[PDB]
Design a protein around this ligand. Structure first.
Ligand SMILES: *[C@@H]1O[C@H](CO)[C@@H](O[C@@H]2O[C@H](CO)[C@@H](O[C@@H]3O[C@H](CO)[C@@H](O)[C@H](O[C@H]4O[C@H](CO)[C@@H](O)[C@H](O)[C@@H]4O)[C@@H]3O)[C@H](O)[C@H]2NC(C)=O)[C@H](O)[C@H]1NC(C)=O
Length: 666
């Protein structure tokens, strides 16, 4: 019951309505001063910064699915208590708030840790959620792959980085996969043809670094063999960002990869806040869910009792959704419609019946149903409740049914891949522009790509214009299925972004478009601070960012870095030829992080600068320092500021979000 895979972390659940945050530690105690020592569940209040412990680590007991943390302080009932109802899950999960009184506090937790067979357990998994400062919940548990991995986008054809989110990669029951050669325990697998190396393992949980960005770090450390990483400990730092109209969705992209210190930006909807829904219904609402189909008697074998459940209706003393009968025939109501509560809470469907007859103790009976998704449940889809424990006369049940399976995506990307080949239509996108729409040859056929129509001649602000689903690689081309329908075929025409879609076919519609946007993406280089993508139509030019008497200053804990774009830096201690320079804030000792130059690299929306001159290190290898600046497209960032990436002591990577990297330039 004190499952190991959950110990050594302090978890968090939130009473979204009463404005309360609970900290849970199922093995030790919360590290906090303010709710004393050996508090296993520490309640605290956002109104009234008042931190009251509501479960002690020593006073711990289990009964069936429930783990119980009792206290000695009194409430009256009599003493304050916290329970967690455990269900087997597909990932490590997070405890969710169910309900509380002034005595009891109830949580539920779907986790692999409560599964009895160890096949469902990852070699190593870490918490995969954060709370922001509005207590809104960012949870990446849906991105976690139980089998396989995600290929990270990179320009190099000979090597591929594969990652999983918050756990290692499961290579099993897929022997044909190229991942098979990857050593076990790896969250981040580098393959070079036929070798497979471990460049990162799960360590700590998801962090929130600067109000909005989720950061996860894989490390290796205890391995040794810096084969081709020349002295550096391999590492992977993923940065998860919530899509905008400043920055729309992407696949995971490799923004840096020197010295086996890999950096990954990944813009995906699963990074945005999770909404906590509620109602006094059997229906909720991102997307809908309806539990009225199950009102169809349901019964569950209890301790020495039977439970009778009629959820959502009476099926025809009464007014009692759940009734308890001792197997002797005296009966008690365990919950009624006088307040029933249906919660969808970060993927968890939970139903409480708050009525109930008062028991011999001071408690008024209560019933909690945790619905689980099962398409092939039984009772042709409706399934059947299972009694899973009782505490202070609250009775818990778990209920597989197909009518709990409502798990909708819509992280629609405007690209497509085919092995390592990637395609991206972002150049066609016209977004609330001074630009017009596209017009092929309403009123006139007006088209936009992975975006609503613009009101330039005005069509229909959302005749029928669809505008959902991601594009796919059809018969040698890219197909875009606009669904209510319009099928758009886009054909690679190197160099041409100027031309428009065409006629072809009049409730079905078909357009054909020859565009450089339909060409496979590839890496290009340029000089004089410009880079020309010839298969696409255009060039990027970062020269406006070039300072004349340089210095973009970048302050960290111990260092100030001074860098310029495509020209040298010019401040007090630095050598006048470096494009990047490190000054220690206590000592003013200075390192040269590489000579400036104006050769731009460009691949799939990332522009790169590499300074390579650089003060040597203290070793036989002659190894001079180097600097990487990755420029990333942020439409409304403007010129933007550089940002140092924390790595080891000998890697100098900067990220720079700027409009000048976005597909509006020369
Ligand atoms: C970045 O800018 C610098 C200037 O500060 C530049 O050095 C210059 O390089 C070019 C080409 O290497 C030199 O020659 C030409 O200047 C004339 C102006 O009359 C242009 O017509 C030229 O265009 C052609 O240049 C080459 C000449 O054969 C061709 O190979 C090329 O394909 C073009 O068709 C070019 O601009 C120029 O004289 C120097 N400047 C000095 C002072 O020596 C540097 O080369 C630029 N980087 C580039 C262009 O990639």
């Amino acid at each position: 019951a004190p499952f190991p895979e959950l110990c050594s972390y302090t978890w968090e659940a939130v009473d979204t309505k009463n404005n309360v945050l609970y900290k849970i530690n199922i093995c030790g105690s919360v590290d906090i001063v303010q709710c004393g020592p050996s508090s296993a569940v520490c309640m605290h209040d956002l109104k009234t910064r008042t931190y009251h412990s509501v479960g002690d680590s020593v006073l711990r007991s289990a009964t069936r699915s429930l783990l119980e943390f009792n206290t000695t302080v009194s409430c009256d009932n009599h003493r304050v208590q916290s329970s967690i109802a455990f269900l087997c899950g597909k990932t490590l999960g997070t405890p969710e708030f169910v309900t509380a009184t002034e005595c009891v506090h109830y949580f539920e937790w779907r986790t692999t840790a409560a599964c009895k067979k160890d096949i469902f357990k990852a070699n190593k998994e870490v918490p995969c959620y954060v709370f922001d400062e509005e207590l809104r919940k960012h949870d990446l548990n849906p991105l976690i792959k139980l089998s396989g991995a995600y290929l990270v986008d990179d320009s190099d054809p000979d090597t591929s980085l594969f990652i999983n989110v918050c756990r290692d990669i499961d290579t099993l029951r897929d022997p044909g996969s190229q991942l098979r050669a990857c050593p076990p325990g790896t969250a981040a697998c580098l393959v070079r043809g036929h070798q497979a190396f471990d460049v990162g393992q799960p360590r700590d949980g998801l962090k929130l670094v600067r109000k909005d960005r989720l950061v996860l770090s894989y490390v290796r450390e205890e391995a040794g063999k810096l084969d081709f990483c020349d002295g550096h400990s391999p590492a992977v730092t993923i940065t998860f960002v919530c899509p905008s109209e400043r920055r729309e969705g992407t696949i995971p992209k490799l923004t840096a990869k020197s010295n086996c210190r890999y950096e990954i930006e990944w813009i995906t909807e699963y990074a945005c806040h999770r909404d906590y829904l509620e109602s006094k219904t059997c229906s909720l609402s991102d997307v809908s869910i309806d539990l009225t189909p199950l009102a169809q008697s349901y019964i569950s074998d209890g301790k020495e009792y039977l439970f009778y459940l009629n959820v959502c209706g009476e099926t025809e003393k009464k007014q009692a959704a759940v009734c308890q009968v001792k197997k002797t025939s005296q009966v008690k109501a365990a919950g009624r419609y006088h307040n029933q509560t249906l919660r969808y809470s970060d993927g968890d469907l939970t139903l409480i019946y708050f009525g109930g007859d008062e028991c011999s103790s001071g408690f008024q009976r209560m019933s909690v149903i945790n619905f689980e998704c099962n398409k092939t449940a039984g009772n042709d889809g409706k399934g059947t409740p299972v009694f899973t424990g009782e505490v202070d006369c609250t009775y818990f049940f778990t209920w597989d049914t197909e009518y709990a399976c409502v798990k909708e995506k819509e992280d629609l990307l405007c690209g497509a891949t085919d092995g390592k080949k990637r395609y991206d239509l972002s150049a066609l996108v016209r977004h609330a522009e001074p630009e017009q729409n596209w017009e092929a040859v309403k009123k006139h056929f007006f088209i936009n790509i992975c975006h609503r129509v613009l009101q330039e001649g005005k069509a229909r602000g959302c005749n029928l214009g669809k505008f959902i689903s991601s594009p796919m690689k059809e018969k040698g081309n890219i197909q875009l299925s606009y669904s209510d329908k319009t099928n758009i075929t886009l054909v690679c025409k190197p160099g041409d972004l100027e031309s428009a879609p065409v006629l072809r076919t009049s409730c079905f519609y078909e357009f054909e478009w020859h565009t450089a946007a339909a060409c496979v993406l590839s890496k290009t280089e340029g000089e004089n601070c410009t880079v020309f993508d010839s298969q696409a139509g255009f060039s990027f030019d970062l020269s406006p960012l070039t300072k004349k008497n340089g210095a973009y200053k970048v302050e960290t804990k111990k260092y100030d870095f001074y860098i310029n774009v495509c020209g040298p830096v010019s401040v007090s201690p630095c050598q006048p030829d470096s494009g990047a320079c490190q000054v220690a804030k206590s000592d003013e000792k200075t390192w040269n992080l590489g000579l400036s130059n104006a050769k731009l690299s460009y691949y799939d929306g990332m522009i790169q600068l590499n300074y390579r001159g650089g003060t040597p290190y203290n070793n036989e290898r002659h190894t001079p320092r180097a600097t990487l600046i990755t420029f990333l497209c942020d439409r409304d960032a403007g010129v933007g500021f550089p940002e140092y990436q924390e790595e080891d002591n000998s890697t100098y990577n900067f990220r720079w979000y700027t409009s000048y990297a976005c597909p509006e330039e020369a």
